[PDB]
Amino acid sequence: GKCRGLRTARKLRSHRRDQKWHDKQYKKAHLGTALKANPFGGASHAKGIVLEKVGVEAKQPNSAIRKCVRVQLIKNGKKITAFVPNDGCLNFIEENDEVLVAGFGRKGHAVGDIPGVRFKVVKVANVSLLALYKGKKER
Amino acid sequence: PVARSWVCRKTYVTPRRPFEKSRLDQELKLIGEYGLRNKREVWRVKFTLAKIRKAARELLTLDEKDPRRLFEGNALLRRLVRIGVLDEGKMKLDYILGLKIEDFLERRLQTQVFKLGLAKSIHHARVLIRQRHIRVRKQVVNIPSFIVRLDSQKHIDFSLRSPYGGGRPGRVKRKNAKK
Amino acid sequence: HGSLARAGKVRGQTPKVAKQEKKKKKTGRAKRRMQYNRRFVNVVPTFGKKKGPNA
Amino acid sequence: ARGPKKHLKRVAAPKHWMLDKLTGVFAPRPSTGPHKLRECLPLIVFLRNRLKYALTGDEVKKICMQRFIKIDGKVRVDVTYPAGFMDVISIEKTGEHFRLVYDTKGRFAVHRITVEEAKYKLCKVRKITVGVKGIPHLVTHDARTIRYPDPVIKVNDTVQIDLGTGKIINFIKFDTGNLCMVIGGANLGRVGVITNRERHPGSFDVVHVKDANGNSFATRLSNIFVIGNGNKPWISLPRGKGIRLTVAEERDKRLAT
Amino acid sequence: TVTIRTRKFMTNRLLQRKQMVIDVLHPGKATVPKTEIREKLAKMYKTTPDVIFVFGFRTHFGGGKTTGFGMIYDSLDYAKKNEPKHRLARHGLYEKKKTSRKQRKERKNRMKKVRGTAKANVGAG
RNA sequence: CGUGCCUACCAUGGUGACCACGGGUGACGGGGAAUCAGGGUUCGAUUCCGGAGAGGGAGCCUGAGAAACGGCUACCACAUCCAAGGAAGGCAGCAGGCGCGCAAAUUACCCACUCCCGACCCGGGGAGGUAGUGACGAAAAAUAACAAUACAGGACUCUUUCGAGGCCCUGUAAUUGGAAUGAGUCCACUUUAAAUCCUUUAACGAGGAUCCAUUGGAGGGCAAGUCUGGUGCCAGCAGCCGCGGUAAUUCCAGCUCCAAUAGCGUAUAUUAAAGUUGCUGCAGUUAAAAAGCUCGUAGUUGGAUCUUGGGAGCGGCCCCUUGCC
Ligand SMILES: [Mg+2]
Ligand SMILES: [Mg+2]
Ligand SMILES: [Mg+2]
Ligand SMILES: [Mg+2]
Ligand SMILES: [Mg+2]
Ligand SMILES: [Mg+2]
Ligand SMILES: [Mg+2]
Ligand SMILES: [Mg+2]
Ligand SMILES: [Mg+2]
Ligand SMILES: [Mg+2]
Ligand SMILES: [Mg+2]
Ligand SMILES: [Mg+2]
Ligand SMILES: [Mg+2]
Ligand SMILES: [Mg+2]
Ligand SMILES: [Mg+2]
Ligand SMILES: [Mg+2]
Ligand SMILES: [Mg+2]
Ligand SMILES: [Mg+2]
Ligand SMILES: [Mg+2]
């Protein structure tokens, strides 16, 4: 039961402009609470300071203990658990270091095996964990 | 502020599907036949063909008596005749759509060189067009992916070069050793 | 909560293997040339049922 | 901004100056003169770009201030004195003489007419008025103000003007059946006979023109310059009657070579 | 051995000069210097070598043709007057002898600081 | 200059559900950019047009032209030198520094080009232009091949051939030449204001220590390992599905492969894929969805009906209605 007259462009535009809000992607794109609620301020990366080294549980079909770093942010000031990727790198991270972090696959969701950690460590003291992993430079 | 130029065309298209078994085999046999470098200069030919097809469909869209259709149709036909993809025959627009991919690779530099001799195996023709050993009229050519215009098509003859001109470029080493 | 002791356990306990010498792989044009010649020009004697690109 | 501008960008230059992209940031802004900047032509572009007399811009400043170049019989000291449609350019020490008309495409061209036509210049009447003690005045698009012209000059007429004494001679009026030349709009450089004018009270009248081989255009009154008297041009005109050919006719001409 | 031709030849009696586009041919040797081009053109036009100027050159990718712009002058006064001083500088007729920055600008600011006689003193020495 | 631009008097008006008024913008506006059936959606700080502001905000002289800030006056907030009596300050101009960050270049050279200003052919211009940094991005493009000789891992025209091979593909850390030519090393031209870079040319410059292509990946999606050794729901991998609890096609290593190639992985904004924002072009019995029903203004849509067959002429004109006066 649509509307199809020649003079109905106002009704069509107003109804579409109202019904565009119920999409989740549009409402978190153009409603302010998604930007001013999360960390990173809507940016790709952020620096922070290591607060502590935290091991957390995994889910039930796959049980393990993941290794993460709690981070005071330089920019915003919110505390973040961030996942540290590879086999080592918990040894490569020490207390109170400048750490660059990013997201995983989509910022609204975590990874499957991990409960509530949304963030991935890229660098420690301006050196990547990739270089720290496959014999490259140093801390 | 500054004003020099700002214009940038990508003669280059990434195809959509990354991993297709048929597409990979088709482009691999195309590479192996016409002796190319990598798939970016394969996709050059695909982008040029797609541009000519979009121009051809935009011309076939309009009415026959239209002056823009007549002018741009005759112009595109003259461009294809000067390249050497078409004959001097079928000047309809639909034959342009009848064209395949391999014609541009067939009308490249080194493939026409290999048909006209003095070349000896496409992968060695790659070296012969890079190292200055194959020419065109009076402007010596370095670049492989050259469009041989049909009205020249013949003048491939190269002066002051080691197999035809003369000089001791590295046989000077061997003959100083034979001294 | 759990112990943060074990870290890089497997990569530490992994025995090292000497990275033995490889010949230089041909690059670019020559690589694509042997890619073509390895499977398109002398694999047509073999029959079209089985496939063996690595085993 | 604050007051008048004092520059002009090379990209913001009008199209018909045939200027380049990679050359420089600044276009020559022409001086304030008797012609508008949208219709003018700078002397530095005229000597430098098209005629290939001087490679650099400074050489034009040297020759003009060494007095070689005169406009309408007298020397302009400026390097950027603006020209206009239908102006005399004479050059003294080298026997050469130029006239500014329009190409069929819309551009200025070279037209090497003689000193016999250097003497004679056409111009369009802008408006007419009366001044002190009841004397008449005529105003030219070339910003000539001349008193006691004639009583029988309509507003949109053409006066042949002399550059010796600056006094008028042998006017020509505006009438159905006169040969005119277009100076503006999208159809400039078109030469044809005035067919039919429509007069509106909405301040903008239209004129339909035909030429040889019967092709017809239409334009507005300020874009119109009457050039002849009943299909007879007063002034010699370059490239035939300056008819615009066709895209296809240009292609066939260049194929005929 | 080398061949100089003139393509495009402008007459300019406004400046008392003659301009030409110069094609220098090369089946052999490298790009010919300023001397021998000048002598070969001065012989083929039969005038004096100290008055013909030439500038600007490309190379068309393997032997080939180098294209230049050549000024032919009649008189030395017209040569000195119609040329830019940087093209005088190849023949040494014009010099400024110390082309440094901060000299003109620091003289400007020291003259903008003080006034009059001591201004002339510091700005002249 | 025209005007509620301001004064005085008088009238009581003006706008709005066709979205007024009021908030928000991580909003300067356009010409444009990205995105490919078509239709759109998302940006447009930024080289062109136009507007605004020089720490906030106010006032003003000169001048045709300013509420100018590389002009002035006071306040506020900073901040310099002080002999403590006072002086000068305004980089969101060019380089450069501190801070801020995820995030950004040398205190260079020149008025030679472009044009601009002044009394003026000559002065001056961090406006500009040239060089240095520059994997923002783009174009073209070697990276050791190349034809060889020989051994054949052996395919192919076909003869009992257990091979003629005037074709061949490829492994030859096998030899041989072209010792092809380039990157670098440097003379000399040119280039340019002065150099530089490119091109040109001379002299060197390759036999695997060469003059060395990496980035990711190999269960499915998704091209490519049911190879080997460790590891034992631990470590860890994996964007999802999932793997790992003593044989792991998935962890860690080696070997062999796969894909793109001097550019690949990653994070994020955003477009198509998404006919999962649907006007073209979606649904509404049961999956999410037809208001409890009805009246009703604004909106939206609204039956039919009023000028026709012909004629002249070939192979567009007049009327029997065809522009009236
Ligand atoms: Mg997810
Ligand atoms: Mg301004
Ligand atoms: Mg009042
Ligand atoms: Mg804002
Ligand atoms: Mg598109
Ligand atoms: Mg579109
Ligand atoms: Mg602006
Ligand atoms: Mg202002
Ligand atoms: Mg200013
Ligand atoms: Mg400042
Ligand atoms: Mg990996
Ligand atoms: Mg593996
Ligand atoms: Mg597969
Ligand atoms: Mg991943
Ligand atoms: Mg649906
Ligand atoms: Mg239910
Ligand atoms: Mg339901
Ligand atoms: Mg109603
Ligand atoms: Mg009706």
At E14, list the tokens. 């406004």
> Under an 8 A CB cutoff, do B71 and D251 touch?
yes
Residue in this structure with the two tokens 């009248």, named with its chain if needed: D205
Q: How far is the CA of D19 from the centre of ligand 7 (A)?
A: 22
d(CA B61, CA B64): 9
Say how far apart CA E3 and CA E26 lie, in whole Å: 8
Q: Judge: B71–D248 Cβ closer than 8 Å, yes or no.
A: yes
For residue A124, the one-letter residue type is: V
Which residues are within 8 A (CB) of D195 and not within 5 positions of it... i.e. 6 or more apart? D176, D207, D208, D209, D210, D216
Contact A91, C7 (CB under 8 A): yes
Using N-to-C axis directions, what is the helix angle for B40-61 and B21-34, rounded to 10°? 100
* φ, ψ (nearest 5 deg) of residue B85: -85, -40
Q: Check if the beta carbon of residue D82 is closer than 8 Å to that of residue D30.
A: yes
Q: Hey, are the CB atoms on C35 and B38 less than 8 Å from each other?
A: no
Placement of tokens 């690059």 in the chain: C27
The answer to whether the beta carbons of residues A25 and A18 sit under 8 Å apart is no
The DSSP line for chain E is ---EEEEEEEEETTTTEEEEEEEEEESSSS---HHHHHHHHHHHHTS-GGGEEEE-----SSSEEEEEEEEEES-HHHHHHHS-HHHHTTTTS---S---TTHHHHHHHHHHHS-THHHHHHHH-
Hey, what are A92's tokens?
A: 């490569």
C28 touches chain B (CB under 8 A): yes
Q: Determine the 3-state secondary structure of B14 from DSSP.
A: coil
Chain D residues touching residue E10 (CB < 8 angstroms): 52-53
CA-based nearest residue to D95, from D113, D77, D109: D113
Does the beta carbon of A70 lie under 8 angstroms from any beta carbon of chain C?
A: no
Q: Which residues pair with E64 in a beta bridge?
A: E26
Residue D206's DSSP bridge partners are D198, D220
Torsion over CA: E66, E67, E68, E72 (sign)? positive
Residue type, A98: E
Q: B67 and D24: CB-CB below 8 Å?
A: no
- D63 contacts on E by Cβ (under 8 Å): 14-15
Nearest to B3 among D10, D246, D248 (CB): D10
Kindly list the distances between the CA atom of residue A76 and the CA atoms of A53, A71, D41, in Å, as whole numbers in the listed order. 21, 11, 60
The string of DSSP codes covering D171-240 is -B---TT-EEEE-SGGGTT-EEEEEEEE--SSS--EEEEE-GGG-EEEEEGGGEEE-BSSS-BSS--SST
C-alpha B68/C-alpha B59 separation (Å) is: 8
Q: Give the separation between CA E27 and CA D114, rounded to whole angstroms.
A: 48
Report CA(A30)–C1'(F27) in Å, whole number: 14
DSSP-derived 3-state class of residue B148: coil
Ligand number, closest to the Cα atom of A133: 11
Tell me the C-alpha to C-alpha distance, in Å, between residue E49 and each of A96, E22, E25, E46: 78, 16, 20, 9
A51 three-class SS: strand
E13/D93 CB distance under 8 A = yes
Question: What number of other Cβ atoms are within 10 A of residue B34's Cβ?
Answer: 18
Buried b (16+ CB within 10 A) or exposed e, D157-194: bbbebebeeeebeebbebeeebbbbbbbeeebbbbbbb
CA-nearest residue to C3 within chain A is: A55
Q: Which one-letter DSSP state was computed for residue C16?
A: P
| Residue D173 identity (one-letter amino acid) | K
**Chain C contact present for A57, CB below 8 A:** yes
* Whole-number Å distance between alpha carbons of C3 and A106: 30
Cβ contacts of C24 within 8 Å, gap of 6 or more: none
> Is the CB of residue E13 less than 8 Å away from at least one CB of chain D?
yes
- Amino acid identity at B35: G
Per-residue CA distances from D143 to D26, D32, D83, D146, D188 (Å): 28, 12, 12, 10, 21
Distance (Å) of CA D81 to CA B112, D47, D164: 58, 12, 20
**B80 by DSSP, 3-state: which?**
helix
Distance from CA of E14 to the nearest CA of D (A): 6
Tokens read off for A59: 């889910």
> Looking at chain B, which residue has its C-alpha nearest residue C40?
B29
Pairing mode of beta strands D158-162, D179-182: unpaired
According to DSSP, the β-strands at A119-124 and A79-83 are parallel
- Interchain contact, D59 vs E10, CB within 8 Å: no
Alpha-carbon span C11 to A87, nearest angstrom: 7
Check: CB of residue D244 under 8 Å from CB of residue D236.
Answer: no
Which residues in chain D are immediately followed by a break of C to N over 2.5 Å? none
C47 residue type, one letter: F
Query: What is the DSSP code (8-state) at residue B24?
Result: H
All partners of chain C with 3 or more CB pairs under 8 angstroms = A, B
Judged by DSSP in three states, A18 sits in helix
Eight-class DSSP state of A52: E
Q: Do residues D218 and D253 make contact, with C-beta atoms less than 8 angstroms apart?
A: no
To the nearest whole Å, the CA of E73 is away from the closest chain D CA by 14
Question: In terms of Cα–Cα distance, which of D124, D130, D127, D164 is closest to D147?
Answer: D130
Residue D115 Cα to ligand 9 middle (Å): 51
User: Chains near A, with 3+ CB pairs < 8 A?
Assistant: C
Q: In angstroms, how far is F173 C1' from B45 CA?
A: 39
Q: Helix C29-39 crosses helix B21-34 at what angle (to 10 degrees)?
A: 110
Question: What is the distance between the alpha carbons of residues D191 and D226, in angstroms, rounded to a whole number?
Answer: 9
Q: What string of DSSP letters covers chain D?
A: --S-----BTTTS-GGG---SSS-SBPPPPPS-SS-TTT---HHHIIIIIS-S-SSSHHHHHHHHTT-EEETTEE---SS----SS-EEEETTTTEEEE--B-SSS-B------HHHHSEEEEEEEEEEE-TTS-EEEEETT--EEES--SS--TT-EEEEESSS--B-S-B---TT-EEEE-SGGGTT-EEEEEEEE--SSS--EEEEE-GGG-EEEEEGGGEEE-BSSS-BSS--SSTT-----HHHHHHHHHH-
Å separating the CA of residue C46 from the C1' of nucleotide F250? 32
D34 forms beta bridges with: none
Single out the residue of E41, E60, E59 nearest to residue E51, CA to CA: E41
* Residues D89/D100, Cβ–Cβ less than 8 Å: yes
Distance CA C28, CA C34 (A): 10
Smallest Cα distance from E87 to chain B, Å: 26
Task: Write out chain D residues lying below 8 Å of B67, CB-based.
Answer: 246-248
Measured between CB atoms, does E30 come within 8 Å of chain D?
Answer: no
Q: For B58 and F301, how far is CA from C1' in angstroms?
A: 39
Cα D80 off chain centre by: 17
Burial of A82 (0-12, 13-18, 19+ CB in 10 A): buried
Record: contact E14-D53, CB cut-off 8 A: yes
- Taking the centre of ligand 1 as the mean of its atom positions, its distance from the CA of residue A112, in whole angstroms, is 7
D46-54 contacts, C-beta under 8 A, 24 or more apart: D46/D83, D46/D89, D46/D108, D49/D17, D49/D18, D49/D19, D50/D18, D50/D108, D50/D110, D51/D110, D52/E10, D53/E10, D53/E12, D53/E14
| Token pair for A111 | 């990874």
**CA pair distance C7, A87, nearest whole angstrom:** 6
Interchain CB distance below 8 Å, B37 and C29: yes
Q: Pick from D207, D203, D221: which is nearest to D126 by CA?
A: D221
C contact test, residue of B38, B128, B145 with most C CBs within 10 A: B38
Neighbours of chain B (3+ CB pairs under 8 A): C, D, E
Whole-angstrom Cα distance, residue E122 to residue E125?
Answer: 5
* Residue B54: CB atoms within 10 Å: 10
Query: Among all strands, which nt has the closest C1' to A76 (CA)?
Result: F101
Alpha-carbon distance of D64 to D76, in angstroms, equals 7
CA dihedral B72, B73, B77, B80 (to 10 degrees): 60
3-state SS assignment for residue C9: helix
Q: What is the DSSP string of B81-129?
A: HHHTSS-SS--SSHHHHH--SHHHHHTSHHHHHHHTSS--SHHHHHHHH
Could you give the CA distance from residue B51 to residue B34 in angstroms, rounded to a whole number?
A: 22
Q: Are strands D145-147 and D96-99 parallel, antiparallel or unpaired?
A: unpaired
Ramachandran category for residue A89: left, alpha or beta (phi over 0 → left; psi -120 to 50 → alpha) = left
The verdict on D58 touching E (C-beta cutoff 8 Å) is: yes
| Cα–Cα distance, D33 to D101 (Å, whole number) | 18
CB atoms within 10 A of CB E84: 11
Surface-to-core class of residue D226, CB atoms within 10 Å of its CB (0-12 exposed, 13-18 middle, 19+ buried)? buried
Contacts of B129 (CB under 8 A, 6+ apart): B109, B110, B113, B141, B142, B143, B144, B146
Residue A99: Cβ within 10 Å count: 24
C8–A55 C-beta distance less than 8 A: no
Nearest CA in chain C to A91: C7
Give SS3 for A57. strand
Integer Cα distance of D59 and D68 in angstroms:
12
